[PDB]
Each structure stands twice: as C-alpha cells, then as structure tokens.
Amino acid sequence: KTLEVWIMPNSPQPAEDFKALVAPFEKAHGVEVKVTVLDWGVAWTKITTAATSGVGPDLTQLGTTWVGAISAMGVLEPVDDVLEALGGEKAYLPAVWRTTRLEGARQATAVPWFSELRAFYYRTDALKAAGVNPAEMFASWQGFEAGLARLKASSFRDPETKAPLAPLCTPGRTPRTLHNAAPWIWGAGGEIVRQAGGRWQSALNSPESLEGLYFFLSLAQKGYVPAESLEKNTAQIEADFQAGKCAVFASGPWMIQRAQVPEAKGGFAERTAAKNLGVAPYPAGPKGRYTFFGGSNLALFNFSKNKPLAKELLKYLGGPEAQVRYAQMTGMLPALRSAWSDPSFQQNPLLRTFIQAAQFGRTYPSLAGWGGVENLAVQHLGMAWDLVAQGRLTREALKDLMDKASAAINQALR
C-alpha cells in the first residue's frame, strides 16, 4: 500500500522535508507515502489535467486561491469530517476557513495545511545609513515615498557588491498574480471584484482601485524601482534582494527560514541581506491597512482508491504537531490557530511582525472563476508595467487598461 501526494516546492529540499514530516504516519499506519513535487509555474496545469482525466494522486496541495475552481469541477471529496476532527470552524481564522470550500458551496473540499502573508523586508543597515526611521517609512503612503526618496539620495553601498541599493525592488514582468498589487488596491479603499445585485463584477476600474494601482506603479516611474527590476519576475527580484541589490522588497515569511540556511542548501545566510534583515507590515493606505493573506490546502480526489488512509493523512497533516513541524521546515505559518502560540513562531522577532500583520490579512473570494479573473487582471497589469518602463503610465492610460480588464472579467463572470 502506497499513498500518492502532490506538493509544491515549500522548502529547500521539499520532497525530503515532506517525507520526514509523514514518517510517524507511515509507521502508525503501516503504509508508504510517495511524494511528487510540482513547481508553482506548472502545478496548476498538471493538477487541472489530473482533475479532468481522473489520473492523479490521492492528495494534492492547492494554493488557497485555486480551491474554488478545482472544487467546482466536482472532483474533490467532502472533508467536513476531517475539519470536524481538527476542531472545525472555531480552530481557524475566518481568513483560512473561507478557503476550505467553493464560495457558496455546502461542503468543505480543502483542509488548511499552512498560511502565509505578505510584508516588506528591508535592510536594517541601508535604512540606518539613509537615516530613515522604519516606524515612519512603513506607517503610511507618504511615509513610504519619503522613505524611498531618502533611500534614493543615500550614499550607502552593500558591503559585498560595493554598489548602491535599489530603494524598492518589485517585478515589472507580466505577474502570475495580483499578490503584489492587491494591498495597494485595498489600502486605497479599492477591490478586485465586488459582490452586488446578486453578481460579482470587476472593481479594478474604480476610482479607489486606480488610485491604489497608480500610486504603486508610479513609484517605479519616479526612480524608486530601477529599470532592471521592470524586466524581472518575482523569483529574479528575490535573488536580487538576497544578492544585495534592493533595500526593500515585499514577500512571504519563508524568507526568514531561508536567511538562516546556506546558499548551497537553497538559502542566503552568508549574504549581508541575511545578517541585516528587517520586516515591517504594509503601511496604512487612505482607507486601511491590508496585506494579501494566503497559503495552501490539501484536497482528496474523489476518484482516489485510498480515501480512508488519505483522510487520516489529512487529519495528520492538519493537526497541531505536524502543523508545528512543517511550518518550522518551510518557514510558513501553521493554518491551525492553536499552533501559532508555539515559541518557535512567537520568539522569532521577524516572524512576530508577520503574526501581528495577520490582523490585516485579506483574502480573495473563493470563486470557481477566480483563476480567469486573476489572469485577465495580470495580463492588463503587465501592459501597465510596460508603460511604466517607457515613463508613459498616466492616470488615463491606466483607467483605459483597467476599463478593458473589467470588460473581459465581467464577460468571464457572466
């Protein structure tokens, strides 16, 4: 007997970490667990192929944003019995509870595995040379621009690159997701889709949503983001934060874990970045503080022939002990609220800011169509980055792009 599980690269040796995690399960149950690791760029397609063909694992990891769309295909086993065993609705942040199901659906089709949310890493050394107070830089949108202007005029140079630092690094390539932009949209009072009149519509083109996007993209148009970042994707901008080219960069909590790991083992501990590492939450916008709150869930294909064992492995992976163990390996946060108290998370000062930032965690609605919305958003957003790369993003050019993304998104939804 072999359980087949699919995971994404959640830690530097993802398959080994996962196998070490489930070994007590294997012994207690006298079964073997076979792990496949799919990269984040293709995971969506091979998972969707598995759902359409009925050929695949027992369990798969899903990004919290995917659960809506796979559940709607009617390929996932109810796990209301697993969630019940784990403590039920009371044992999660509503931010996590909303991702166990298709929005509006009767029954849970996903168990929360881990959580993650976005904040700003900075270089403690570089802000201190600019004479920038991080409590003021990251307090509001004026604070931030003031932070970046001072960071741009600083004579500071990285010890190892003996070169000045990019003030903000963010990617300008067509994004995979609105993960980077969403907090700007939200903090301006805006949103990506809106529920009204018994329908979801695009709000990408609202005054609020454009205010947020333009504020964010125009930072790049004012020389806070160097041209070279406009041509890179998330993973490139992250190597560059690690190799000492950027003073400020928005990411998830895993980069705290990787900073303690040697470059050989898939981290950056030897880098200066790692020795001089700060975290601050997104600054408050005109209409609130928000950050993108996400993570991954586990779901059982209803065409699995190992559904009993696969539920005990769900109950295993979702329960306090394996919750603690895997968050430590991956540098993510447990999904189960009780596991957040562990001193491993509480007494790590950088991970503490992510934990306090989580009060302002916001999520995407779990709509069957959510992938289709996000894909059209990001396509249009990519055409906005290309105008920034010309110095040609104006308010009206951005309105025009988002009125076109809203026309296509509306069609998709209706």
Ligand X SMILES: OC[C@H]1O[C@@H](O[C@H]2[C@H](O)[C@@H](O)[C@H](O[C@H]3[C@H](O)[C@@H](O)[C@H](O[C@H]4[C@H](O)[C@@H](O)[C@H](O[C@H]5[C@H](O)[C@@H](O)[C@H](O)O[C@@H]5CO)O[C@@H]4CO)O[C@@H]3CO)O[C@@H]2CO)[C@H](O)[C@@H](O)[C@@H]1O
Residue from 10, 180, 276, 353 touching Cl ion (CB under 5 A): that is 180
How many residues appear in the chain?
414
DSSP for residue 10: -
Residue 175 interacts with which of Cl ion, ligand X, none, CB < 5 to 8 Å by class: Cl ion
Residue 235 binding: pick among ligand X, Cl ion, none (C-beta 5-8 Å cut-off by kind): ligand X
Which residue reads 């988002």 in tokens?
A: 402
65 near ligand X, judged by CB under 6 A: yes
Given candidates 63, 164, 320, 372, which one binds ligand X under the rule CB under 6 A?
Answer: 63
CB of 62 or CB of 178, closer to Cl ion: 178
Among all chains, which residue has been given the structure tokens 């201190």? 128
* Closest to Cl ion by CB, 103 or 211: 211
Least separation in angstroms between residue 381's CB and Cl ion is 6
12: partner contacted, choices Cl ion, ligand X, none (Cβ within 5-8 A by kind): ligand X
Residues 6+ apart with CB under 8 A from 259: 267, 268, 269, 273, 274, 277
* CB-based contact 173:382 (threshold 8 Å): yes
Site string for ligand X, 107-146 (x = CB under 6 A): ---------x------------------------------
**End-to-end Cα distance, the chain:** 45
CA 256, CA 273: separation in Å to the nearest integer? Answer: 11
**In the complex, which residue's CB is closest to ligand X?**
63
Question: Cβ–Cβ contacts within 10 Å for residue 2, how many?
Answer: 10
Residue type, 268: F
> Can residue 252 be called a binding residue for ligand X (CB under 6 A)?
yes
* Residue 190 · residue 362 · CB < 8 Å: no
Binds 294: which of ligand X, Cl ion, none (CB < 5-8 Å by kind): ligand X
| Cβ nearer to ligand X, comparing 130 with 357 | 357
In the list 3, 12, 69, 357, the residue contacting ligand X (rule: CB under 6 A) is 12
Among 303, 305, 298, CA closest to 319: 298
How far apart, in whole angstroms, are the C-alpha atoms of residue 73 and residue 71?
A: 5
SS3 of 338, please?
Answer: helix
Shortest CB 111 distance to ligand X, Å: 15
Q: Candidates 46-54, 208-216, 289-297, 320-328 — which segment interacts with ligand X by CB under 6 A?
A: 289-297
**Which spans of this chain sit near ligand X (rule: CB under 6 A)?**
9-12, 40, 63-66, 116, 177, 234-235, 238, 252, 254, 258, 266, 294-296
